[PDB]
Point group: C3
């Protein structure tokens, strides 16, 4: 029964660790959204200064790629949570 006790201890820490990883993925999702936003504001001002100086700054796809990736990480966060719960049931 050294094995069964070791297994539950392992599973408990494996569950906590995937929970920690899940947070890092969350913080990364948010950091990525924050960047998308920064590119957004940059896109505005630089194009306004480009209009008062009268090259177009176009970051729309970079912006949308980043908000998509950010959403994708959220899917992962959800799918991971399901798996974490499953691990916890053993």
């Amino acid at each position: 029964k050294i094995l069964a006790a070791s297994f539950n201890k392992a599973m408990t820490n494996i569950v906590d660790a995937f929970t920690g990883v899940n947070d890092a993925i969350t913080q990364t999702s948010q950091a990525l959204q924050t960047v998308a936003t920064a590119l957004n504001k940059i896109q505005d001002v630089v194009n306004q200064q480009g209009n008062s100086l009268n090259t177009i700054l176009n970051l729309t796809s970079e912006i949308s790629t980043l908000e998509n990736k950010s959403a994708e990480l959220n899917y992962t966060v959800q799918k991971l949570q399901t798996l974490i719960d499953n691990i916890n049931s053993t």
Copy 2:
């Protein structure tokens, strides 16, 4: 007492699935970093033409290095996930 063997298998299954999702997450971050590096280049270029010189050369190159490291990580992880999956009894 072979509830323990049944528990071990389900656990390994979800751990394999869980590390696989985490690898998707890392892959998405790596590519996102390339997206940003691209974004920084465009910003650098456009701002210098409207013109202090905006120099993002080091940030851009740091970011593609980080992206390369993350990819290397994903490849290395993929092997380990399989090792884990072979342990089902």
Copy 3:
């Protein structure tokens, strides 16, 4: 005893996998600081051409927060990783 051998193999690779993930998180943490730095430089220069208004102060401070937070996760995870490693029978 077949199960315990499988258990050890799994735990060993699970420990390796979490270490690979921890590298990824570390690399991501550092990339975010780099992003924050670049956004800072963009702000200065863009605001400087603006006087001859771009506000990114909070995003920069957000990204440096996430970056610090990511490091706290890694260091906590290493404690959990060792716990996993101690279970080897």
